Amino acid sequence: ANRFTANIKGLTQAQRNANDGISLAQTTEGALTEVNNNLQRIRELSVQAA
Amino acid sequence: ANRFTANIKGLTQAQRNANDGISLAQTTEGALTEVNNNLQRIRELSVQAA
């Protein structure tokens, strides 16, 4: 029983760490979204200037 | 979807470039009309002098 209760808490904390990783991925995704939009604008201006 | 968007945006401005071309072509013709009208009269005057 000692070993069962020794094993439980680790898994709990692991769930916490997974949540943190989720959040990290989301923030990076948003940044890349903005970069994408700017490159689209550059494309259109370059065909303007052609 | 991104590569569909890119070409839609490019084509739309490519559509305006053609209008520029049509306008240029149209403008030159009005100039040439008067040149023609002057040559027509020069020939006829030269007929009178023979």
From TrEMBL, chains A, B:
Coiled coil: none
Role, per record: Flagellin is the subunit protein which polymerizes to form the filaments of bacterial flagella.
Protein name as catalogued: Flagellin
Full-sequence range covered: 51 to 100 of 396
Entry similarity comment: Belongs to the bacterial flagellin family.
Taxonomic superkingdom: Bacteria
Record's subcellular location: Secreted; Bacterial flagellum
